[PDB]
């Protein structure tokens, strides 16, 4: 499919930034996770970034470490995550869906097989947190064979060879983190940039778009609202709706 291209074309028509929340699949349980995700979309999420619970999430701070433990405490498995993703896609035909994976869950049952399952349930992209561009070839090839965008992080300690590699190898969007990074990435015809460095306020979304980013990725801020409101499901959904409404409003201008 072309869900990221269509979304950016529609947003560029509207002179509008993307707002993309991150949540852990099955946090705090399968049914509540599905309700949380439907609430983010209803409230104006342009796209989703969805974590699969992993035993040793070495790229995650404590907010998301705790999100995975909550999901394991509910028995959430990779197979249950693929069932959830098929249900989300069945409800929501156009929203780009990206996964945040750890390499072992992609490699476990065979890399080709992993990306074939992603394509069957209608996932758009995969970011493998512990596969740098230097190790990426078999992952990026299997992704593209199954119409999945491989997503790369352009860190702040990036150099020009890394910018050319991320620009050539990535698809869908470039995960960002002087921010002239954005102009070089455009010069190198990179996938549109989403800024993802601790985006937790409306002003940061506006600022990302003003810098020339196509939008912003939150994540942690969303999981924090889940953590805070465990004891009140309907207050959780109210605070999630208000947060996403505010972050999405910030992207129109």
């Amino acid at each position: 499919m072309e869900r990221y291209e269509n979304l950016f074309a529609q947003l560029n028509d509207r002179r509008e930034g993307a707002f993309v929340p991150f949540v852990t699949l099955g946090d705090p349980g399968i049914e509540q996770s599905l309700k949380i995700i439907d609430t983010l979309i209803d409230a104006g999420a342009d796209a989703l970034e969805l974590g699969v619970p992993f035993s040793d999430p070495l790229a995650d701070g404590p907010t998301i470490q705790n999100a995975n433990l909550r999901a394991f405490a509910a028995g959430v498995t990779p197979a249950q995550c693929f069932e959830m993703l098929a249900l989300i896609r069945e409800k929501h035909p156009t929203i780009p869906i990206g996964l945040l994976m750890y390499a072992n869950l992609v490699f476990n049952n065979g890399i080709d097989a992993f990306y074939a399952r992603c394509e069957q349930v209608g996932v758009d992209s995969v970011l493998v947190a512990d596969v740098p561009v230097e190790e990426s070839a078999p992952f990026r090839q299997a992704a593209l064979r199954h119409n999945i965008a491989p997503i790369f992080i352009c860190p702040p300690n990036a150099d020009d060879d890394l910018l050319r590699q991320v620009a050539s190898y990535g698809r869908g969007y470039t995960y960002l983190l002087l921010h002239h990074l954005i102009e070089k990435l455009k010069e190198y015809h990179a996938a549109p940039a989403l800024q993802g460095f601790g985006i937790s306020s409306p002003e940061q979304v506006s600022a990302a778009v003003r810098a020339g980013a196509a939008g912003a990725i939150s994540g942690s801020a969303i999981v924090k609202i889940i953590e805070k409101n465990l004891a009140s499901p309907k207050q959780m959904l109210a605070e999630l709706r208000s947060f996403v409404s505010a972050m999405k409003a910030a992207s129109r201008a």
């Binding site: 476990n108 190790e135 790369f152 060879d161």
Partner: protein, 394 residues
């Protein structure tokens, strides 16, 4: 792009978030530079000799082999300053940290031997040291904790996941992402992302080099086999490296069998796990059918790890090295036998290697064989553990 090959056949690599790649590239160039620098080599040799006490003895064990055609030598890494082989490569890595202009050290430990070695090296060389350790591990290793703090190190317990060595490993990489301009990550085994498996081997290879010189002096020939326990792989690759091209010399690595391979409570991923990607490397893992990393088990904290260094996976694949397992009960018997018949108290980790040598002898007592066991550490740290088992069974 790298200066050296990050792979041993299909095993190894650099499976880290993009943000850590510059730290690994910087470390590789500093290592390649240091290995060509006679002043670096001279400073390293000085510390090994005059501070750590190298060369270590090679002890012939006559009582334990009486009435068989086995001749057994022990390579006495137990006599190194700190009481384990871990000291050798901590001294080299601390000098690399200084070469790179770093002022701070991060280290993981399970048992506490690498943490003690990192804290002693940091005290000597004027580095500020922090040690991530399983909260489970902290609560079981209060001796080695107190030693680290006496030597001015910060010991950080880990609440994350199973709260153990893999999470301790997990915690250390977590920290280095942000601090690598100022801090060096002092990885304690021949595993993790390139260039650590290579660096740790080269900073442990004096074990095998000395063993080869000493066995030529004493016996006028190479050993039939050298035998070492395998937790992550550093003492074994240190003993193996200088013999890899001596194709007559057997290389035997001993993984922990725990309660028995058939129980699933073991630490033997090389022979009983399957390949995965974790801790920065493609290597054999103990993992669930779903690809979650499993918890290992051994009576010996220093072997209790669900992966293995990629060079051991490679040496196994091509048949250059053979890997076996030894259970808790076999290790304990070898521990008691060495104490009673040679007056040496071995680390329970090292007792795995000894137990396999004793099996080689006892199974085939009229086979002529010249064996060396790497005695990776002393067993003072294990006497409470052994006491507690002996009380329980009698």
């Amino acid at each position: 792009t790298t200066l050296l090959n990050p792979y041993f056949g299909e095993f190894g690599g650099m499976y880290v978030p993009q943000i850590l790649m510059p730290a690994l590239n910087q470390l590789e160039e500093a290592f390649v530079s240091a290995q060509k620098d006679p002043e670096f080599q001279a400073q390293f040799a000085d510390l090994l000799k005059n501070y750590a006490g190298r060369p270590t003895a090679l002890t012939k064990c006559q009582n334990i082999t009486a009435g068989t055609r086995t001749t057994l030598y022990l390579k006495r890494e137990d006599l190194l300053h700190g009481g384990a082989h871990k000291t050798n490569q901590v001294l080299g890595q601390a000098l690399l940290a200084k070469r790179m202009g770093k002022s701070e050290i991060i280290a993981e430990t399970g048992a506490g031997a690498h943490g003690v070695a990192s804290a002693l090296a940091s005290a000597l060389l004027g580095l500020k040291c922090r040690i991530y350790m399983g909260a489970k591990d902290v609560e079981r290793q209060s001796p080695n904790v107190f030693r680290m703090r006496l030597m001015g190190a910060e010991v950080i317990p880990v609440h994350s996941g199973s709260a153990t060595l893999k999470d301790a490993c997990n915690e250390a990489l977590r920290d280095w992402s942000g601090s690598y301009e100022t801090a060096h990550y002092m990885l304690g085994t021949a595993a993790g992302p390139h260039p650590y498996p290579t660096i740790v081997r080269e900073f442990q290879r004096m074990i095998g080099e000395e063993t080869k010189a000493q066995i030529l002096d004493k016996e006028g020939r190479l050993p039939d086999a050298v035998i070492a326990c395998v937790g992550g792989g550093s003492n074994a690759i240190g003993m193996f490296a200088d013999f890899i091209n001596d194709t007559s010399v057997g290389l035997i690595g001993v993984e922990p069998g725990g309660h028995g391979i058939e129980t699933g409570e073991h630490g033997a991923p090389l022979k009983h796990g399957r390949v995965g990607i974790y801790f920065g490397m493609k290597a054999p893992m103990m993992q669930t059918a779903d690809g979650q990393i499993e918890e290992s088990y051994s009576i010996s904290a220093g072997l209790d790890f669900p992966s293995v260094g990629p060079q051991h996976a490679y040496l196994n694949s091509i048949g250059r090295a053979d890997y076996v397992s030894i259970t808790d009960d076999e290790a304990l018997e070898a521990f008691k036998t060495l104490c009673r018949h040679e007056g040496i108290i071995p680390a329970l980790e090292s007792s795995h290697a000894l137990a396999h040598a004793l099996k080689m002898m006892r199974e085939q007592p009229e086979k002529e064989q010249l064996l060396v066991v790497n005695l990776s550490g002393r067993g003072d740290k294990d006497i409470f553990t052994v006491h507690d088992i002996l009380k329980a069974r009698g």
